[PDB]
Design a protein around this ligand. Structure first.
Ligand SMILES: CC(=O)SCCNC(=O)CCNC(=O)[C@H](O)C(C)(C)COP(=O)(O)OP(=O)(O)OC[C@H]1O[C@@H](n2cnc3c(N)ncnc32)[C@H](O)[C@@H]1OP(=O)(O)O
Ligand SMILES: CC(=O)SCCNC(=O)CCNC(=O)[C@H](O)C(C)(C)COP(=O)(O)OP(=O)(O)OC[C@H]1O[C@@H](n2cnc3c(N)ncnc32)[C@H](O)[C@@H]1OP(=O)(O)O
Lengths: 178, 178
């Protein structure tokens, strides 16, 4: 339950958020630009505060608020971590008031996952209609590995979740080639 | 947190297990024939008892001990349930001292998932080297939808998890054709 540093980027564990930061995360999370692409649309403050409390005893779920030179970039998570099998799932939503930031969050987040946690593989669940996220991860060398068919209810139809992954060798190859 | 009935089969929620049944489940679970195919190999009694306690406040995770005319058939679960999106994951291990039983557990379990819970889809994670389980689900009309690549550590190598699913229409088609 500690923070991390990558370049001039800080990853603030959710369990170390000051009270302003707790509300900022909630604002980021409930914004239409974020919520539309989440499994649940709206998080009450009560739910949010409880979630953060529960994270204190949930070492397999790590949420970070990313900050860089005074700017809050957005949120990244590494979840359903398993340390024997060395896998985890990645999640990101950027500050909805900023034009970019996702790339920076991803780089720091992958540093944490592959170097600090020494994970072997990272997996992604992304809604099949989330074209901006799909393109984003494909550009970052994430590779398609399947679907969860009809996993999501959207506008009264069931649509798919897409599954992507990156392993440690892939991560290494990116870094060897600067 | 209630039990269910399907034909002459009882599904006993883990939160309603008598103390003998709690130890029987643990015996089923830690047996080499079960454990070899689980994400974790060995569950201590302490962990087990805590797990059952936590299930009392975990409506999205349902574990059942199946019994039929005095015979304990094994365990089935419907987990990571989401009631807006109407999905869940299925899991089974039979009484390792019996030659069959999986089929019976599956039928009752699918009844619970699709009729009682009214889920739209059920998903499976199965280790790629688990040939007996693979054949079993394929025979029961589960359909391949992808992989979690290198998800599992086995004998110091990383192997894959296979993803399968069945939806409500598939379930219906089976039942229409008796
Ligand atoms: C596995 C999962 O995490 S699934 C859930 C994914 N999360 C979400 O969908 C939440 C909503 N979306 C986001 O948080 C983000 O858009 C992410 C994390 C998906 C991607 O991060 P982004 O910063 O948006 O990366 P992206 O490549 O799409 O940025 C757009 C680029 O074009 C510009 N741009 C900004 N907005 C847009 C836009 N709507 N359309 C096209 N270009 C845009 C930007 O300037 C940026 O380029 P630059 O940094 O060089 O200046
Ligand atoms: C998504 C998930 O749940 S993944 C984890 C799956 N669970 C496990 O791997 C735990 C260990 N294995 C099991 O629990 C079970 O074997 C299951 C649930 C996978 C399948 O249930 P089973 O009862 O074994 O079904 P299966 O079709 O393989 O039964 C074997 C059949 O051939 C006979 N048979 C019994 N043992 C064997 C055996 N080792 N090999 C071949 N045939 C056998 C049986 O008589 C049975 O037929 P019958 O009921 O008509 O008499």
């Amino acid at each position: 339950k500690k923070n991390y540093s990558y370049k001039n980027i800080q990853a603030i564990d959710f369990t170390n958020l000051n009270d302003g930061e707790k509300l900022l995360v909630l604002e980021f999370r409930n914004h239409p630009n974020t919520a539309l692409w989440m499994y649940s649309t709206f998080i009450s403050l009560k739910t949010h505060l409880q979630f953060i409390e529960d994270l204190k005893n949930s070492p397999n779920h790590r949420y970070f608020l990313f900050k860089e030179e005074g700017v809050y970039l957005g949120v990244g998570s590494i979840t359903k971590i398993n340390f024997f099998h060395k896998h985890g799932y990645l999640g990101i939503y950027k500050n909805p008031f900023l034009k970019n930031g996702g790339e920076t969050i991803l780089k720091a987040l992958e540093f944490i996952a592959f170097e600090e946690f020494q994970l072997h593989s990272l997996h992604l669940e992304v809604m099949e209609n989330n074209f901006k996220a799909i393109a984003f991860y494909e550009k970052n060398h994430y590779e398609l590995e399947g679907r969860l068919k009809g996993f999501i209810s959207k506008d009264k139809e069931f649509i798919d979740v897409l599954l992507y992954y990156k392993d440690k060798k892939g991560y290494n190859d990116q870094s060897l080639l600067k």
